[PDB]
Design a protein around this ligand. Structure first.
Ligand SMILES: CC(=O)N1CC[NH+](CCn2c(CCc3ccc(C)c(C#N)c3)nc3cc(-c4c(C)noc4C)ccc32)CC1
Length: 114
């Protein structure tokens, strides 16, 4: 049946790493509301790990056996960072490493529970 909501939420929180300098921890516009005018045009759909953990606790991912919806939220976080900060920035480098690690951890979770 469905995944345990707390276990998925714990997976999400484990993706918030000091190795990524916590850049995906919370909504970009929660920490930097002054970016909103430019950010919402470049990135009209936002996500962050605190939001994703709450989605997990409410069952948003529970019936997605492959966790494809969570993978899509991770991909949105990374692609928004690359789009807004630009492809030559250090933020873009962190985004790519973050997404790769997140995919490895999500895949391991699916294999341990499928
Ligand atoms: C939960 C909480 O209280 N937090 C956790 C989050 N930090 C903010 C972290 N952060 C810092 C500061 C650390 C830093 C500086 C410079 C570089 C090149 C790197 C890298 N790579 C990292 N730049 C940030 C930039 C963004 C960001 C995104 C995503 N897309 O557009 C922007 C702008 C988000 C968080 C950021 C505030 C305190």
């Amino acid at each position: 049946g469905p995944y345990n909501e707390a276990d998925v939420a714990a997976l999400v929180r484990s993706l918030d790493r000091a190795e990524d300098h916590h850049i995906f921890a919370v909504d970009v516009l929660e920490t930097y509301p002054y970016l909103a005018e430019s950010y919402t045009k470049v990135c009209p759909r936002r996500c962050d790990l605190a939001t994703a953990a709450q989605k997990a606790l409410e069952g948003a991912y529970s019936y997605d056996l492959r966790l494809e919806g969570l993978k899509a939220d991770i991909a949105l976080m990374a692609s928004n960072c690359i789009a807004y900060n630009g492809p030559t920035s250090a933020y873009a480098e962190t985004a790519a490493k973050f997404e790769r690690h997140a995919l490895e951890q999500i895949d391991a979770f699916v294999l341990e529970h499928n």
